[PDB]
Amino acid sequence: DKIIHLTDDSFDTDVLKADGAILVDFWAEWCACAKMIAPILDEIADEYQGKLTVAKLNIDQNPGTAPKYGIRGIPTLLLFKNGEVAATKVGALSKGQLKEFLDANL
């Protein structure tokens, strides 16, 4: 219960105008690989508590944000630092790859 659920409208304030690091997961029910990293994320939010905020945005109920970052495929992870994007990963990945990605930017 540490993962934040974003909406197209709260994206400004929960992410863009928030100080600190936020990992944003762009997903949807119809993409199995997008849902297969959710378990992994639950673990990541716990282990990076205090140094990172994990957020999820279902693109089906919030279709306005993805195009704004030219996202063409899911899942896509957006590591935001103080409001601006720092790094991106496209495609499903193991917990280890995700951890590696975070460690190379936090």
Decide: 74 and 27 in contact? Cβ < 8 Å.
yes
Between 53 and 62, CB nearer to a copy of itself: 62
Straight-line distance from the first to the last Cα atom of the chain, in angstroms, rounded to the nearest whole number: 22
Closest CA relative to residue 34, chosen from 76, 88, 83, 95:
76
Between 3 and 28, CB nearer to a copy of itself: 28
Q: Which one of 20, 39, 73, 83 is in contact with a copy of itself (CB under 8 A)? A: 73
> Distance between CA atoms of 55 and 18, rounded to whole angstroms?
12
Contact letters for a copy of itself, residues 26-55 (x by CB under 8 A)? ---xxxxxxxx-------------------
> Distance between CA atoms of 30 and 53, rounded to whole angstroms?
25
Between 68 and 72, CB nearer to a copy of itself: 72
Residues that bind a copy of itself (CB under 8 A): 29-36, 72-76, 90-94
